[PDB]
Structure 1
Amino acid sequence: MISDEQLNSLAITFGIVMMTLIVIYHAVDSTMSPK
């Protein structure tokens, strides 16, 4: 079974990936969209 430290690292990596892709999307939409 997966350990506890491995699960902690997995959760942190999922959160970092999510918070980075969200910012990438927002920074693409702010420029590419007609303002």
Structure 2
Amino acid sequence: MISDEQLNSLAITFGIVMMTLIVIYHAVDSTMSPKN
């Protein structure tokens, strides 16, 4: 993250991959949340 760029197409790409590691980091670091 340097200048004006369209590279905010990472904050989707990366960010479904960060949303799976955060919600995973909540099962490891914090208390276990199961869905099913």
TM-score interval, smaller chain: 0.3 to 0.5
Q: Which gives a bigger RCO, structure 1 or 2 (Cα 8 Å, sep 6+)? A: 2
| CA-based RMSD | 5.4
Show structure 1 runs of 4+ deviating over 6 A.
1-9, 32-35
User: Normalising by structure 2, what TM-score?
Assistant: 0.40
User: Normalising by structure 1, what TM-score?
Assistant: 0.41
Q: Which has the higher helix share?
A: 1
Same amino acid, percent of matched pairs: 100
Structure 2 stretches of 5 or more lacking a match?
Answer: none
Equivalent pairs, count: 35
